[PDB]
Amino acid sequence: FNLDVDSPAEYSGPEGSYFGFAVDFFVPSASSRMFLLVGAPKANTTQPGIVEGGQVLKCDWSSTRRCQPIEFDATGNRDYAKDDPLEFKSHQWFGASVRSKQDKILACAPLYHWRTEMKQEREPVGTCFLQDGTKTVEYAPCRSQDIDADGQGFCQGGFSIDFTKADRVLLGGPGSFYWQGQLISDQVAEIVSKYDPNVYSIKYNNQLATRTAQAIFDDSYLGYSVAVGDFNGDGIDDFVSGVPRAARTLGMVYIYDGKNMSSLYNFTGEQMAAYFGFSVAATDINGDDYADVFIGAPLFMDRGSDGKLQEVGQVSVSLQRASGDFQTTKLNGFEVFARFGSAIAPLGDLDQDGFNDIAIAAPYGGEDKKGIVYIFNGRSTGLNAVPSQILEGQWAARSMPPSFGYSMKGATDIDKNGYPDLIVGAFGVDRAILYRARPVITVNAGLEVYPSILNQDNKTCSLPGTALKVSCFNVRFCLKADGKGVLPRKLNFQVELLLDKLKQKGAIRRALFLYSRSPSHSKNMTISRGGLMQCEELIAYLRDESEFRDKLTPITIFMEYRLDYRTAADTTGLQPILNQFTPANISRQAHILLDCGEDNVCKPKLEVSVDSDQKKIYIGDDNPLTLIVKAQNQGEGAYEAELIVSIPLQADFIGVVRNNEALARLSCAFKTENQTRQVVCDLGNPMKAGTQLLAGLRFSVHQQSEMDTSVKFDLQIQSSNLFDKVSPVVSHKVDLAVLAAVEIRGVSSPDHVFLPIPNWEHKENPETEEDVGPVVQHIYELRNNGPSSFSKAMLHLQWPYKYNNNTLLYILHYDIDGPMNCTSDMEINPLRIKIDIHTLGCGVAQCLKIVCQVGRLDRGKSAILYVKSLLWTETFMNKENQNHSYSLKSSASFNVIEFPYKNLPIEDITNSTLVTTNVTWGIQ
Amino acid sequence: GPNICTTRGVSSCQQCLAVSPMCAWCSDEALPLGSPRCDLKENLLKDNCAPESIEFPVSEARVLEDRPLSDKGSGDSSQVTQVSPQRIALRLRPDDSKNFSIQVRQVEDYPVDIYYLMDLSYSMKDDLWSIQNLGTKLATQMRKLTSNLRIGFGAFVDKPVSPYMYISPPEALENPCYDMKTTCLPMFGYKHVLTLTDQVTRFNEEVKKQSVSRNRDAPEGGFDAIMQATVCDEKIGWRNDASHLLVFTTDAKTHIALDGRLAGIVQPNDGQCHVGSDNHYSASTTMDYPSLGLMTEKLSQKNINLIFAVTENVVNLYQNYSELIPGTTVGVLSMDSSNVLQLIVDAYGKIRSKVELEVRDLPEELSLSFNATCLNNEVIPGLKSCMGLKIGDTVSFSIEAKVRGCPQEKEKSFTIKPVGFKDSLIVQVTFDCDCACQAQAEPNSHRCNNGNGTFECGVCRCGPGWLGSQCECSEEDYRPSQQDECSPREGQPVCSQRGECLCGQCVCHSSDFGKITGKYCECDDFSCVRYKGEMCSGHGQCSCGDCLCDSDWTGYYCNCTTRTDTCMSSNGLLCSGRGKCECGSCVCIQPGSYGDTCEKCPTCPDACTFKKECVECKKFDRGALHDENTCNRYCRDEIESVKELKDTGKDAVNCTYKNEDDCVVRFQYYEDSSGKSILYVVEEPECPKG
Amino acid sequence: CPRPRGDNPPLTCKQDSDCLAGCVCGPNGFCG
Ligand SMILES: *[C@@H]1O[C@H](CO)[C@@H](O[C@@H]2O[C@H](CO)[C@@H](O[C@@H]3O[C@H](CO[C@@H]4O[C@H](CO)[C@@H](O[C@H]5O[C@H](CO)[C@@H](O)[C@H](O)[C@@H]5O)[C@H](O)[C@@H]4O)[C@@H](O)[C@H](O[C@H]4O[C@H](CO)[C@@H](O)[C@H](O)[C@@H]4O)[C@@H]3O)[C@H](O)[C@H]2NC(C)=O)[C@H](O)[C@H]1NC(C)=O
Ligand SMILES: *[C@@H]1O[C@H](CO)[C@@H](O[C@@H]2O[C@H](CO)[C@@H](O[C@@H]3O[C@H](CO)[C@@H](O)[C@H](O[C@H]4O[C@H](CO)[C@@H](O)[C@H](O)[C@@H]4O)[C@@H]3O)[C@H](O)[C@H]2NC(C)=O)[C@H](O)[C@H]1NC(C)=O
Ligand SMILES: *[C@@H]1O[C@H](CO)[C@@H](O[C@@H]2O[C@H](CO)[C@@H](O[C@@H]3O[C@H](CO)[C@@H](O)[C@H](O[C@H]4O[C@H](CO)[C@@H](O)[C@H](O)[C@@H]4O)[C@@H]3O)[C@H](O)[C@H]2NC(C)=O)[C@H](O)[C@H]1NC(C)=O
Ligand SMILES: *[C@@H]1O[C@H](CO)[C@@H](O[C@@H]2O[C@H](CO)[C@@H](O[C@@H]3O[C@H](CO)[C@@H](O)[C@H](O)[C@@H]3O)[C@H](O)[C@H]2NC(C)=O)[C@H](O)[C@H]1NC(C)=O
Ligand SMILES: *[C@@H]1O[C@H](CO)[C@@H](O[C@@H]2O[C@H](CO)[C@@H](O[C@@H]3O[C@H](CO)[C@@H](O)[C@H](O)[C@@H]3O)[C@H](O)[C@H]2NC(C)=O)[C@H](O)[C@H]1NC(C)=O
Ligand SMILES: *[C@@H]1O[C@H](CO)[C@@H](O[C@@H]2O[C@H](CO)[C@@H](O)[C@H](O)[C@H]2NC(C)=O)[C@H](O)[C@H]1NC(C)=O
Ligand SMILES: *[C@@H]1O[C@H](CO)[C@@H](O[C@@H]2O[C@H](CO)[C@@H](O)[C@H](O)[C@H]2NC(C)=O)[C@H](O)[C@H]1NC(C)=O
Ligand SMILES: *[C@@H]1O[C@H](CO)[C@@H](O[C@@H]2O[C@H](CO)[C@@H](O)[C@H](O)[C@H]2NC(C)=O)[C@H](O)[C@H]1NC(C)=O
Ligand SMILES: *[C@@H]1O[C@H](CO)[C@@H](O)[C@H](O)[C@H]1NC(C)=O
Ligand SMILES: *[C@@H]1O[C@H](CO)[C@@H](O)[C@H](O)[C@H]1NC(C)=O
Ligand SMILES: *[C@@H]1O[C@H](CO)[C@@H](O)[C@H](O)[C@H]1NC(C)=O
Ligand SMILES: *[C@@H]1O[C@H](CO)[C@@H](O)[C@H](O)[C@H]1NC(C)=O
Ligand SMILES: [Cl-]
Ligand SMILES: [Mn+2]
Ligand SMILES: [Mn+2]
Ligand SMILES: [Mn+2]
Ligand SMILES: [Mn+2]
Ligand SMILES: [Mn+2]
Ligand SMILES: [Mn+2]
Ligand SMILES: [Mn+2]
Ligand SMILES: [Mn+2]
């Protein structure tokens, strides 16, 4: 929120050169100066025969905003023979990526085409150049003898580049192995020591690189984007890369180890064609010393308010934990077709709050499609998803959209002001903008009003003029300041004081400042810095009692501070800024003495009561608990009465009841400060004597790491009196209860079989399913619906196996879906098959039982048993001839034995069901 | 008397109409009393001021053009009409809703246009079978569904640049199959070949010439073609009042937007036509591929239906792509399918199996509800779409329009129309925020007691301080004998709180962080409910303690959405037919069902129970669906009586039931193996003996 | 059978000598 948008540094390059396609800082060791690097991959050069070779420019700061090219090559196209050139540098996009470690400058040309040394071709292996002061080497790890897009022929190496802590280059080339993509890493020393201008394909020792894979991974574009950070155990930075056509254009993100280039972690996109992995970033946003992953999907389509897909782009935010896993949240864009996840740039700590910050850009958003940059401040909780500042592009299109924010670099303090700064490029207009941070000041103010309870009978200040006494008091206001970074040592503030502001609206103002004879007073104030709260004082007084009425409303003293920003010169007024989450004013109230008794002082007798009316709440669900509160003031008036209900972690405040006219609506507010959480309800100012209030407060629960066995609320009334200001604390609890609505359901599929069965013939020894009979399938489901879960339960199946020593439903096989193991008291499928009405249950038939042990079923989970049987047709012919129709009845019962909620009342949950398969003749 | 309109309407005429649609205001200019000048339409029985000077506007849903729905779309001598009405006028006073209805019909014999996009890359050498004799292949299909057919086609390979193009020895510029030791054509981005004509002869002739070209990488980027074929309206020759079908044939995967950065192409697609006299996509080398979002937009604008006619190796891919472009269909293309020579009448069948309503240019403070009557007086609330229709059916939607507050703007016209049809219902919206007497009789420095009355007709209000019907509300605290009952019951304190009543008119006006208003200052503007730390869940404005939800949100808290997409199953039915959609989440009502969309139900009866009802009404003309007249809508499966043949075991789903005649009917249904789940019935059921 | 890479079809086929790696001879005249 502290970037200076007023007067930033504008840099401009030649027309049509895509000046600003890539930006970075240059902070060498041999100079206390710092510079800007801005790539112009379309710029023209003095290289002979080379149209649009591209440049990298060194931009001076501190004055003159002058950018001079850095000449890396100056050489035209080398030759393979007399008229057979070996390389083609025209339109090579030199400068499409620029990176810098302290004195090293790495720039690349991803469209650099190369004739092979085998056959006449034009292959875009791409190249890089690494400059270190005056020494300049050529780095082209894709220009090797592995050619022709079966290998590195179309690498376009240098499409993305980066450095690690230990001076190791990371390079990405998306065209390797039929556009599978490739990563290549080399030691910077090995790059410069092994350089040989007469050798085109250079072996680098200690190189890391990915290999070709199966042709299924073709056209994945690994190396589109790269970032570095450590994710496993050491200090050795590991490799991150975006591969946005992977996984069937879902997109993916590969993380490789920094020591031996082995797969570490994977991220996969949620929606096809979104380009998940167009850009990546590594930075620690929650200050936990663990680097966190940021992945941009600029073309992501989410659901609008109506529910239609809209292209808004989405950035993935994944926080690293020590366990190795990731907590990943998501963050959608704000404007359609803005391409919100295009560039992601860590800023370091833009605010110096202790937690690093990040900037995300939507180059095609804003007004007139001129580009937007949102900055997001990190906190301990992760990233704050609500931007705190918004940078708007200022340059309108010439021919193509000024892609403001397409390239960004941060985390470098160019003005040495203590706060890092931010480069933003817009290659559509050939410009690059540098925003400078500001010195955030945190200011704490005070306001002391001497005696807050004012007697009008007590007149001591004869000072009004004309020597008549009046009832007066003092208004003392203190003001201290402090702030990290470089910023002037004495700050100037403009304090304003307003008396009784609550009725400035045309009613009479019943307190005036002594000398000025007015409600308002202002004073230019000057504090140095750092915790010495400098105070000033004034004298206000109550006008004559005859001049007004309305003694009961309080005199509110209002104080605000301004901090004129004309200070902080020294480079064009880098003006500081107050902490964003800080109040620009403080208020305090004074009361006219009234109805306080003989002691001349108001002493209340405060009581608070609470009744349950809803005696038990169940564990798994989110329960509408309503508390009825009674707040009484049986003594004298209470100044600034507030009901304070301190809720535990499980609780959330819904609101006040307004549908029971017997219960009074209250102004309640949820507050979370001073390491606590509670609800603040206004009870009157003053809360007059004998007053009784009834009101309802609704809540919600989660039970917060189960087996707690109770939720506890604490209630007390607090007032700004001097004596008897508080009520006795009243604790109210509500008992946690276990409720599990468990049910068992069953069905037969089919539920009938009509005899005779087509194409059936008695087999002496049946082998196939078709020989035995049709396929009857019983399915039993144990479904847990109630809020509370359970840990263990049993399930018993009774099955009509035989009748008069003859098979009925020959169980072939059984399956289980869920947390359950079953066991049958008889061998299943002995013969090893491959693939009125009289009821037959266990009361009249030989039964085969199956016993199942159920694990933990939660609120919406179930366990299912599939029984696949064959109708034993042979049985239903001989003595069951034609008028004998049977109902093949099975049953299943369950008993819940165990719950995870120990220490709670536990009631047994048992039930049973039955499933019939009716066999019938279709003759008579 | 003591009613909601008597609290805020007393201030002025504007603020009277604004608080409720039931409010009425009388600025007689003749009869003042001291009663509230804004009470009700009927509470102004006494103190009549009746003939004029009573301001009571009422909202109106006024039809201006409702042509009769056409019976057939084949030269009806004028204006084939698939929607009625065609134009409504809306007059809306603040916070008032007025509803209407719209009738939509997919007429029979509608004109069809078919434009073909053919992949002409090298991989397509073994796929050109599908394109020989295409015109006779196309007339033969569509003739059953329409007369007046038109066809045309174009071709695409890829961007003619590196790294896609063969720039290897210049012998490969004009013959990129040089290295293959054969010959083919130079590559091209998108080449328009044949404008839509009714001359099948010229079509087959122009098609047979076509042969393959060659580039490097398997993605081919037809999306460049899809875009230009959509937005080059005059070049392609799209006809008005004819369904527009755009067919897409390709060998393998496709380039998507942002793939062009590898080619040094960083300018986004503008969705403008760039094909000219050369019939070539000129910007193929300067402009990136189009994104799914822009393709969807330009497809819905120009009312084009995209059909993916792709080979099997890639059918799963474009299926998953079509889910991101709603209303597009995929079809397998292989000379074994028994469907390949249709492939389109099946696609056009799909596209006409649904009618969905879309809204264009909807004013922001306006919000629209929707019911749907899809089948013979079955009103379905919340739906703007009807499922499983045959070409010829007619559906109706009841629409409600609501305005929050009053924009005080000019007339605005938004469109309501079906997806993919030219026909549309245009709604003209005018808002009646101001009374009749606005600039007719208004005071300035006179017409009140002491040269301060201003601000309205009917009463004069005064300057920044000391307002009144007689212009002074003196800052003095004049002692009792002046209250005007700035309180409900006179035993209650001065105006409810936050206000010290002066001069018979409450002087609360105590700005703290939000505004305060009302004759008694009972309204808060910042005391509305919170769902989770956000007032009205962030999706609703707060006025006098009542959440006024935004366009697509409902509820006391404004936390219940009107969406039904999350309720939609993979089959197109909401909640899989077994549940109700409430606040974007299926409430499963049918027992044993659960899951996000009620899809999971293993206790539900086997499909033999639901399909037996189809064979009773289709083959025996009885049963449940026969009595409710739902047989033709719900039973879209083809039913063919068989020769008592039950032949194969390939998933072999056999059923058997017993009808009223005590005869045992048995049938089987081949599930959606090569199609859409046909079911064969064994004729000659088993009946008893004579 | 391996799938062709890039913008290439299956090779051609007269007998299964023209094709390799365990593919077939398509009636259309390709590997498949
Ligand atoms: C993040 O996601 C990444 C991609 O989504 C994951 O990377 C993938 O991990 C896979 C698991 O290791 C890996 O599959 C292995 O691939 C190698 C490749 O070496 C091969 O060597 C042979 C000759 O060069 C050829 O293999 C034969 O088999 C293939 C089919 O697999 C045939 O089609 C071929 O014609 C050939 O006859 C290949 O051409 C290739 O060059 C294999 O050696 C591995 O073999 C192992 O698996 C087999 C079972 O298939 C075992 O029996 C055997 O003992 C081996 O253990 C694997 O198949 C992918 O290549 C790799 N892809 C990429 C792009 O990196 C990554 O793991 C994941 N990380 C995390 C943390 O989740
Ligand atoms: C770096 O230097 C190179 C120098 O070669 C420069 O490239 C040149 O740019 C100009 C203008 O952008 C090109 O001139 C064009 O030439 C083509 C023919 O090849 C013409 O068709 C162009 O348009 C003409 O015709 C139109 C009618 O259809 C007219 O409407 C129009 O006004 C023109 O008359 C135009 O003349 C020139 O070809 C290139 N040279 C090359 C590519 O070799 C490049 O722009 C410089 N880059 C930067 C960043 O400064
Ligand atoms: C009648 O009214 C007059 C003024 O209207 C009033 O005079 C005030 O008297 C009080 C107490 O008698 C004075 O307040 C305190 O005086 C003592 C003197 O020892 C100080 O120690 C106090 O210091 C305060 O501030 C410190 C810094 O914040 C605190 O740390 C400390 O705890 C104290 O709060 C404080 O100044 C006050 O100064 C005078 N005011 C004037 C203008 O004379 C008198 O008390 C009233 N009497 C009756 C009977 O009504
Ligand atoms: C298969 O045959 C059995 C054998 O009867 C059927 O079982 C059910 O048995 C119960 C006995 O409790 C009966 O249900 C009763 O129905 C009467 C009305 O007919 C009702 O008044 C009772 O309160 C009770 O619900 C009945 O015999 C039978 N159930 C039904 C619904 O008829 C079983 O239903 C048969 N299965 C199939 C699929 O037909
Ligand atoms: C919007 O917010 C409100 C309140 O925050 C939610 O209402 C509360 O939740 C449900 C209604 O959805 C009500 O039912 C309660 O839950 C159990 C669940 O089994 C039910 O059996 C009980 O009857 C119990 O009352 C609850 O009363 C209700 N409370 C209030 C104060 O409204 C609502 O769910 C939210 N809606 C959405 C779409 O988020
Ligand atoms: C490549 O490096 C990784 C990590 O450095 C190796 O994986 C494990 O590394 C840890 C220490 O970092 C060892 O304690 C484990 O025993 C390693 N796993 C093994 C040996 O299976 C990995 O082994 C290295 N080599 C590869 C991937 O070939
Ligand atoms: C067993 O299941 C039955 C239902 O299958 C339930 O008991 C009955 O439930 C309904 C009320 O919801 C009524 O039929 C009776 O009032 C209940 N009978 C009772 C409570 O005895 C219940 O889920 C289980 N009941 C028992 C006794 O185990
Ligand atoms: C859509 O269906 C709803 C279903 O209730 C109906 O609208 C409401 O119906 C009941 C009346 O008993 C109440 O919820 C509301 O008074 C009705 N809303 C209105 C009149 O706007 C009605 O059939 C259809 N409503 C709309 C708005 O289309
Ligand atoms: C405070 O600063 C303003 C700024 O110009 C000036 O006008 C005023 O006189 C100053 N007052 C004091 C007391 O310094
Ligand atoms: C089922 O058996 C496995 C292996 O014996 C065991 O690990 C698992 O906990 C069992 N599940 C239940 C619910 O008993
Ligand atoms: C509005 O209410 C229902 C909603 O569908 C509609 O049928 C009815 O005709 C409308 N009533 C009026 C008076 O417009
Ligand atoms: C298509 O989507 C399904 C899930 O919806 C997935 O399992 C499948 O692999 C996808 N296939 C392709 C080709 O995208
Ligand atoms: Cl194929
Ligand atoms: Mn590491
Ligand atoms: Mn971290
Ligand atoms: Mn920070
Ligand atoms: Mn700085
Ligand atoms: Mn007292
Ligand atoms: Mn092919
Ligand atoms: Mn291609
Ligand atoms: Mn191809």
PDB file of C-alpha atoms in Angstrom, chain B residues 68-130:
ATOM      1  CA  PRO B  68     -47.816 -15.461 -33.545  1.00  0.00           C
ATOM      2  CA  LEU B  69     -45.362 -18.351 -33.332  1.00  0.00           C
ATOM      3  CA  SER B  70     -44.723 -19.840 -36.758  1.00  0.00           C
ATOM      4  CA  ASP B  71     -45.893 -23.378 -37.472  1.00  0.00           C
ATOM      5  CA  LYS B  72     -43.058 -24.091 -39.937  1.00  0.00           C
ATOM      6  CA  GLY B  73     -39.973 -22.167 -41.001  1.00  0.00           C
ATOM      7  CA  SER B  74     -40.289 -22.711 -44.764  1.00  0.00           C
ATOM      8  CA  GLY B  75     -41.293 -19.553 -46.644  1.00  0.00           C
ATOM      9  CA  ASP B  76     -44.166 -18.409 -44.410  1.00  0.00           C
ATOM     10  CA  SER B  77     -44.237 -15.196 -46.519  1.00  0.00           C
ATOM     11  CA  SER B  78     -42.777 -13.245 -43.572  1.00  0.00           C
ATOM     12  CA  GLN B  79     -40.620 -13.279 -40.489  1.00  0.00           C
ATOM     13  CA  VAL B  80     -40.318 -16.838 -39.170  1.00  0.00           C
ATOM     14  CA  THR B  81     -41.133 -16.332 -35.491  1.00  0.00           C
ATOM     15  CA  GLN B  82     -39.752 -18.725 -32.871  1.00  0.00           C
ATOM     16  CA  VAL B  83     -40.336 -16.504 -29.818  1.00  0.00           C
ATOM     17  CA  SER B  84     -43.343 -14.498 -28.597  1.00  0.00           C
ATOM     18  CA  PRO B  85     -43.750 -11.809 -27.501  1.00  0.00           C
ATOM     19  CA  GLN B  86     -40.920  -9.883 -29.244  1.00  0.00           C
ATOM     20  CA  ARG B  87     -40.912  -6.550 -27.368  1.00  0.00           C
ATOM     21  CA  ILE B  88     -42.103  -5.507 -23.908  1.00  0.00           C
ATOM     22  CA  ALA B  89     -42.112  -2.110 -22.211  1.00  0.00           C
ATOM     23  CA  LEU B  90     -41.240  -2.033 -18.502  1.00  0.00           C
ATOM     24  CA  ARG B  91     -42.164   0.854 -16.201  1.00  0.00           C
ATOM     25  CA  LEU B  92     -40.711   0.281 -12.730  1.00  0.00           C
ATOM     26  CA  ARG B  93     -41.068   2.341  -9.583  1.00  0.00           C
ATOM     27  CA  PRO B  94     -38.442   1.819  -6.855  1.00  0.00           C
ATOM     28  CA  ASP B  95     -38.226  -1.608  -5.197  1.00  0.00           C
ATOM     29  CA  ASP B  96     -41.134  -2.935  -7.257  1.00  0.00           C
ATOM     30  CA  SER B  97     -41.325  -6.093  -9.339  1.00  0.00           C
ATOM     31  CA  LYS B  98     -43.549  -6.820 -12.332  1.00  0.00           C
ATOM     32  CA  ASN B  99     -43.503 -10.202 -14.056  1.00  0.00           C
ATOM     33  CA  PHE B 100     -44.285 -11.496 -17.548  1.00  0.00           C
ATOM     34  CA  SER B 101     -43.785 -14.648 -19.618  1.00  0.00           C
ATOM     35  CA  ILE B 102     -42.184 -15.703 -22.884  1.00  0.00           C
ATOM     36  CA  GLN B 103     -43.001 -18.479 -25.353  1.00  0.00           C
ATOM     37  CA  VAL B 104     -40.300 -20.317 -27.293  1.00  0.00           C
ATOM     38  CA  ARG B 105     -40.781 -22.848 -30.095  1.00  0.00           C
ATOM     39  CA  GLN B 106     -38.269 -24.737 -32.235  1.00  0.00           C
ATOM     40  CA  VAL B 107     -40.145 -24.735 -35.532  1.00  0.00           C
ATOM     41  CA  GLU B 108     -40.031 -27.610 -37.997  1.00  0.00           C
ATOM     42  CA  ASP B 109     -38.238 -27.302 -41.345  1.00  0.00           C
ATOM     43  CA  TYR B 110     -35.880 -24.620 -40.124  1.00  0.00           C
ATOM     44  CA  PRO B 111     -33.101 -23.672 -42.592  1.00  0.00           C
ATOM     45  CA  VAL B 112     -29.708 -25.211 -41.802  1.00  0.00           C
ATOM     46  CA  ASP B 113     -26.265 -23.848 -42.692  1.00  0.00           C
ATOM     47  CA  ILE B 114     -23.207 -26.105 -42.465  1.00  0.00           C
ATOM     48  CA  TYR B 115     -19.638 -24.808 -42.697  1.00  0.00           C
ATOM     49  CA  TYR B 116     -16.851 -27.396 -42.565  1.00  0.00           C
ATOM     50  CA  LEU B 117     -13.403 -26.843 -41.071  1.00  0.00           C
ATOM     51  CA  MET B 118     -11.028 -29.539 -42.321  1.00  0.00           C
ATOM     52  CA  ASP B 119      -7.612 -30.320 -40.884  1.00  0.00           C
ATOM     53  CA  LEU B 120      -5.316 -30.454 -43.927  1.00  0.00           C
ATOM     54  CA  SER B 121      -2.134 -31.454 -42.069  1.00  0.00           C
ATOM     55  CA  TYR B 122      -0.024 -34.482 -42.964  1.00  0.00           C
ATOM     56  CA  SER B 123      -1.574 -36.612 -40.213  1.00  0.00           C
ATOM     57  CA  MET B 124      -4.939 -36.222 -41.960  1.00  0.00           C
ATOM     58  CA  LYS B 125      -3.731 -38.214 -44.986  1.00  0.00           C
ATOM     59  CA  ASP B 126      -5.414 -41.344 -43.598  1.00  0.00           C
ATOM     60  CA  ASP B 127      -8.572 -39.419 -42.619  1.00  0.00           C
ATOM     61  CA  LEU B 128      -9.631 -37.867 -45.970  1.00  0.00           C
ATOM     62  CA  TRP B 129     -12.097 -40.729 -46.514  1.00  0.00           C
ATOM     63  CA  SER B 130     -14.619 -38.807 -44.367  1.00  0.00           C
TER      64      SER B 130
END
